[PDB]
Design a protein around this ligand. Structure first.
Ligand SMILES: Nc1nc2c(ncn2[C@@H]2O[C@H](COP(=O)(O)OP(=O)(O)OP(=O)(O)O)[C@@H](O)[C@H]2O)c(=O)[nH]1
Ligand SMILES: Nc1nc2c(ncn2[C@@H]2O[C@H](COP(=O)(O)OP(=O)(O)OP(=O)(O)O)[C@@H](O)[C@H]2O)c(=O)[nH]1
Ligand SMILES: Nc1nc2c(ncn2[C@@H]2O[C@H](COP(=O)(O)OP(=O)(O)OP(=O)(O)O)[C@@H](O)[C@H]2O)c(=O)[nH]1
Ligand SMILES: Nc1ncnc2c1ncn2[C@@H]1O[C@H](COP(=O)(O)OP(=O)(O)OP(=O)(O)O)[C@@H](O)[C@H]1O
Ligand SMILES: Nc1ncnc2c1ncn2[C@@H]1O[C@H](COP(=O)(O)OP(=O)(O)OP(=O)(O)O)[C@@H](O)[C@H]1O
Ligand SMILES: Nc1ncnc2c1ncn2[C@@H]1O[C@H](COP(=O)(O)OP(=O)(O)OP(=O)(O)O)[C@@H](O)[C@H]1O
Ligand SMILES: Nc1ccn([C@@H]2O[C@H](COP(=O)(O)OP(=O)(O)OP(=O)(O)O)[C@@H](O)[C@H]2O)c(=O)n1
Ligand SMILES: Nc1ccn([C@@H]2O[C@H](COP(=O)(O)OP(=O)(O)OP(=O)(O)O)[C@@H](O)[C@H]2O)c(=O)n1
Ligand SMILES: Nc1ccn([C@@H]2O[C@H](COP(=O)(O)OP(=O)(O)OP(=O)(O)O)[C@@H](O)[C@H]2O)c(=O)n1
Ligand SMILES: Nc1ccn([C@@H]2O[C@H](COP(=O)(O)OP(=O)(O)OP(=O)(O)O)[C@@H](O)[C@H]2O)c(=O)n1
Ligand SMILES: [Cl-]
Ligand SMILES: [Cl-]
Ligand SMILES: [Cl-]
Ligand SMILES: [Mg+2]
Ligand SMILES: [Mg+2]
Ligand SMILES: [Mg+2]
Ligand SMILES: [Mg+2]
Ligand SMILES: [Mg+2]
Ligand SMILES: [Mg+2]
Ligand SMILES: [Mg+2]
Lengths: 247, 247, 62, 247
C-alpha cells in the first residue's frame, strides 16, 4: 500500500476530511439542527445556560423571574426574592431587604449555531413585566438584531454567532425571547403546505437543556467543549471546532 | 312495544351502538383530539405520566432533569441531585454521594391515542444534554419510530399504540421529545393556508397533565381506567374500551 | 441479619425512616402498613456470600 | 372412586392428616426449630416482639435500654431518655424531666414453641445494670423457671408455653435473657463431639426478628396468626393451630 500522507491514495485521510465536511454540511441542510443558547451571567461567577435544539427554526422565551439565579439544593432567599420581584415589576411595589438582588443577571450572551441565517434572528427584549417597548400598544414584538451578531471563528471558519449585552445598571431588568430560522438557500419553503406539519412537529420535538454552572471555566470545560458548541469567553477567545474540508 | 333484544325495533340498542361508534369516529375526525402519553417508570414502583391532548398534532418534550422522579411534599436529595446531574451531563463533572440516582427513569412507555397516524410518529431521544445523536452537527432532530409501536387491542379493536423501551443500564441517560399527527385520510391539509392559523391555536390550546402515581396499579385504577385511556401494563395486558360498532 | 438490618441505611443522611417503618409493616404482612411507596429502594437487589479459602465448602449452611 | 368422607379410601383425608402430623413431629425432631419470643408491653398499647428461631437451642438477651419503647421515625425524647437511664442505673444519677418513662415495659410475656423442653428453660432476669441477683458475687446466672410456664392450648394440643410477668411497680427495672433447649428424648447428645460443631453453626444460623406493633390486636392479626405462632392475649385466650393427627 502507498505510504500515509504522500499520495492521492491516502483513503483514511480523504475519509477523515469527508467525515468532518459531511457533519458541517448536514448541520446546514434542511435535515439538520438549528440551535440557540442564552447565557445568563450572575455576579457570583455562575452562568445559567438555556439551550434549545430543533429543526427549521428554534427559540427560547423566559420571564424576568426565570432568568434569575436559582441555586438548586441551597438557600435562595425565596420569600425576600418574591418581595424583590414585586419592587422590580413596579417601583416601590415590594418590601424587600436589599437594594439589588445578586440573583439578577449581569449580562446575557445569545449564541446561535452556524446553521442559522443571521438575517432571520429576532429578539423580544422586554421590561420586567414582559412588554417589549414600554407599552404593549406601541411595541413591535421583536427587533431584528442579526447585524450585531459577531462571528465566532476557529481556523477561518464560522462556528457560530454571538450577541452579547451587559446588564450592569440597576434598571437593566429584563424578560427575554429570541428566535432564529435555520438557513434555507433553496426556494422550497419549509413551512409551505407540503412541509408545514413537519414544522409543527419540530415545535414539539425541540429538545431543551438548562443548568447553572458555577463558573465560566466550568461552562467552557464541561458544557461547551465536550459537545463541540461555539462560545466566546469574557476574554474574547473563540471556542468551537472547524469542520469544513479539514481533518 | 316490541320486546327488548328480539327485533330491528330495539331503538335503545341501536342508539347505544351509534353512541359508541360516534365517539370512535369523532375522535378520528379532524375535529377530534390526538393524545400522547409518556410514562417514566422509577425503581420505587412509581410512575410519572405526562399527557398532552390537542387537535391536529400533539407532542411532549422534556429535559433529562424533568423526567427524574420528584416527590411532591417530601424530601428529594435536591442538593445531591444537582450534583448528580452535573456528573450525568459530563463524566466526573459533579460531586454526588451516589453512583446511581434512583430518581432516574428505568423505562419509558410512549402511548398514542387511536386518532394518530402511526407513520407520522417522530422521537427525539437525546443524550443528557439534549442532543439527539451524539453531536448536534450530525443529529437528525428525530427518528420515525412508528414501526415499533404495538397496537393496544381490546375486543379486536385498536385502542391505541405503544412503544416501550427500558433504560436499565447506567448510561441510559436521556432527554425526550415525541410527536404525532392526527390521522388525516383526506387531501385537505390541516396546515395549508385555509386552516394553518387554527393549527397555531391548537398549539396554545393543547391541554397538559402530569402527576406521579405511586404504583402501576394506581395508574391502572385511577388514571387509565376512569378516563378510558389505552394502556399496556408490565404483564402485557391491554387496557382500553372498544367502541366501534359495539354496545 | 434480620430483613431490616439488610436494608440500606445512609449514615448522616435522610432515610425516610418513618415511611420505612411503614414499609416494613407491609413486607411483614401483606397490606399491613401505610407506606407511600410500592418498592423501597432500601431493599437489597442481590446478595453475594463469599467465604475465605480456609472454609470447607461442604460445611456451608444458609 | 369411593365417595369423600365415607371410607378408608379417602386418600385426600389421610394425606391431609399426615401433612399436619408431619409438621407437628418435624418441629419436634432434632432437625426442627426451637423458637422463643419476648414481648415487651408498653403503656401506650404497643408491643415490642423479639423472636429468635434456631436449631437445638435458642435464646434472647436484651439490655434494660434495648427493651425500652423506641418509635421508629418519630420523636423519642432521646436526650431526656438518656437522662432517665442514668437515674434508673443509679438512684438520683440522672437529670430527667419525668418520674416514670412511658418507654419502660409494663409487662413481659416469654413464649416458647412446643419443640422446647420446658425443664430446660432458664431466665437471667437482671437489674437495670445487668446483674441477675443484686450483686455479681452471689448471682446465679439464671433461674430455671419452666414450672411457671402455662401450656398454650388449642383443641386439646400444646401449641406452646407461656410465662408472663407484669412490671407495674416503679422499681420493676430489668435487663432480660432467656434460653431454651429443643426437646431431645433420645440419648444422642446434640452437643457431644459428633454433632457439637453443628450446634456452633446453629448459633450463627439462628434467625432474629423484632418490631414494635401498635396494639395487641395488630400483633394477634398480623404477627401471630399469619405465621401460626402460639399466643396468649390479655383476656387469657389461646392462639395457635393444633396439628397432631388433625385435618
Ligand atoms: N495553513 C497554514 N497552517 C500553518 C502554517 N504554519 C503552521 N500552521 C498550522 O497548521 C494548521 C493547519 O495546517 P494544514 O491543515 O496541514 O494546512 P491546510 O491550510 O488546512 O491545507 P490542507 O490540509 O492541505 O487542505 C494551522 O491551524 C496552524 O496552526 C502555515 O504556514 N500555513
Ligand atoms: N363474538 C363472540 N363472542 C363471544 C362468544 N362466546 C362468548 N363471547 C363473549 O361475547 C362478547 C361479544 O359478544 P356480542 O357483542 O353479543 O357479539 P358480536 O360479535 O359483537 O356481534 P353483534 O353484537 O351482533 O354485532 C365477547 O367479548 C366475548 O367475551 C362467541 O362465540 N362469539
Ligand atoms: N370431638 C368432638 N368435636 C365436636 C363435638 N361437637 C362439635 N364438635 C366440633 O368438632 C371439632 C372436631 O371434630 P372432628 O375433628 O371431626 O372429630 P375428632 O375428635 O378430631 O375425631 P377424628 O377427626 O375422627 O379423628 C371440635 O373442635 C368441635 O368444635 C363433639 O361432640 N365431639
Ligand atoms: N502562519 C500561517 N500562515 C498562513 N496561514 C495560516 C497560518 N496559520 C494558520 N493559517 C491558516 O489561515 C486560515 C486562518 O486560520 P487562523 O487560526 O489564523 O484563524 P482563526 O482561528 O479564525 O483566528 P485566530 O488565530 O486570530 O484566533 C486557516 O486556513 C489556517 O489553517
Ligand atoms: N369464543 C369466541 N369465538 C369467536 N369470537 C369471539 C370469541 N370471543 C370473542 N370473540 C370475538 O372475536 C373478536 C376478537 O375478540 P377478543 O377479545 O378475542 O380480542 P382481544 O380483546 O383484542 O384480544 P385478547 O382476548 O387475546 O386479549 C371480537 O369480535 C370478539 O367479540
Ligand atoms: N362438645 C364436645 N364434646 C366432646 N369433645 C369435644 C367437644 N368439643 C370439642 N371436643 C374435643 O375434645 C378435645 C378438646 O378440645 P377443646 O376445644 O374443648 O380444647 P381447647 O381448645 O384446648 O380448650 P378451650 O375450648 O377450653 O379453649 C378435642 O379432641 C376436641 O376435638
Ligand atoms: N422581606 C422579607 C424577607 C424575608 N422574610 C422572612 O425571611 C425568612 C427566611 O428567609 P427566606 O426569604 O424565606 O429565604 P431563606 O429561608 O434564607 O432561604 P429559602 O429561599 O430556601 O427559603 C422567611 O420566613 C420570611 O418570613 C420576611 O419576613 N420579610
Ligand atoms: N454532595 C452533597 C450532597 C448533599 N450535601 C448536603 O446535604 C444536605 C441535605 O441534603 P439535600 O441534598 O439538600 O437533600 P435533603 O435535605 O435530604 O432533601 P431536599 O431535597 O428537600 O433538600 C444539604 O444541606 C447539602 O449541603 C452536600 O453538602 N454535598
Ligand atoms: N407514611 C408516612 C410516611 C411519612 N410521614 C411523615 O413524613 C415525615 C418526614 O419523613 P420521614 O419518613 O420521617 O423521613 P425523613 O424525615 O425524610 O428522613 P429521616 O429518615 O431522617 O426522618 C415524618 O414526620 C412523618 O410524619 C407520614 O406521616 N406518613
Ligand atoms: N433533661 C433534659 C432533657 C431534654 N433536654 C433538651 O430537650 C431537647 C429536645 O428533647 P429531646 O430529649 O432531644 O427529645 P426530642 O427532640 O423531643 O425527640 P428525639 O428523641 O427525636 O430527639 C434537647 O435538645 C435537649 O437539649 C435538656 O436540655 N435536658
Ligand atoms: Cl436539504
Ligand atoms: Cl373531519
Ligand atoms: Cl431426629
Ligand atoms: Mg437542599
Ligand atoms: Mg487560530
Ligand atoms: Mg412538605
Ligand atoms: Mg379479549
Ligand atoms: Mg446528619
Ligand atoms: Mg422521621
Ligand atoms: Mg377449643
Amino acid at each position: 500500500a502507498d505510504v500515509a500522507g504522500t499520495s492521492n491514495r491516502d483513503f483514511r485521510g480523504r475519509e477523515q476530511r469527508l467525515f468532518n465536511s459531511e457533519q458541517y454540511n448536514y448541520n446546514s441542510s434542511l435535515n439538520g439542527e438549528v440551535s440557540v443558547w442564552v447565557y445568563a451571567y450572575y455576579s457570583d461567577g455562575s452562568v445559567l445556560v438555556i439551550n434549545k435544539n430543533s429543526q427549521y427554526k428554534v427559540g427560547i422565551s423566559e420571564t424576568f423571574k426565570a432568568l434569575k439565579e436559582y441555586r438548586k439544593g441551597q438557600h435562595n432567599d425565596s420569600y425576600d426574592e418574591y418581595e424583590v420581584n414585586q419592587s422590580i415589576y413596579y417601583p416601590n411595589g415590594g418590601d424587600a431587604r436589599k437594594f439589588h438582588s445578586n440573583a439578577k443577571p449581569r449580562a446575557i450572551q445569545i449564541i446561535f449555531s452556524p446553521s442559522v441565517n443571521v438575517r432571520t434572528i429576532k429578539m423580544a427584549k422586554g421590561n420586567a413585566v414582559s412588554v417589549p417597548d414600554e407599552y404593549l400598544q406601541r411595541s413591535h414584538p421583536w427587533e431584528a438584531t442579526g447585524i450585531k451578531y459577531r462571528k465566532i471563528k476557529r481556523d477561518g471558519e464560522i462556528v457560530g454567532y454571538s450577541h452579547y449585552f451587559e446588564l450592569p445598571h440597576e434598571y437593566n431588568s429584563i424578560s427575554l425571547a429570541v428566535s432564529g430560522v435555520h438557513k434555507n438557500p433553496s426556494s422550497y419553503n419549509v413551512g409551505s403546505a407540503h412541509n408545514v406539519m413537519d414544522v409543527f412537529q419540530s415545535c414539539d420535538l425541540a429538545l431543551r437543556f438548562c443548568n447553572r454552572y458555577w463558573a465560566e471555566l466550568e461552562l467552557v470545560n464541561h458544557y461547551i467543549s465536550p459537545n463541540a458548541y461555539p462560545y466566546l469567553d469574557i476574554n474574547n477567545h473563540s471556542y468551537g471546532v472547524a469542520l469544513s474540508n479539514r481533518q
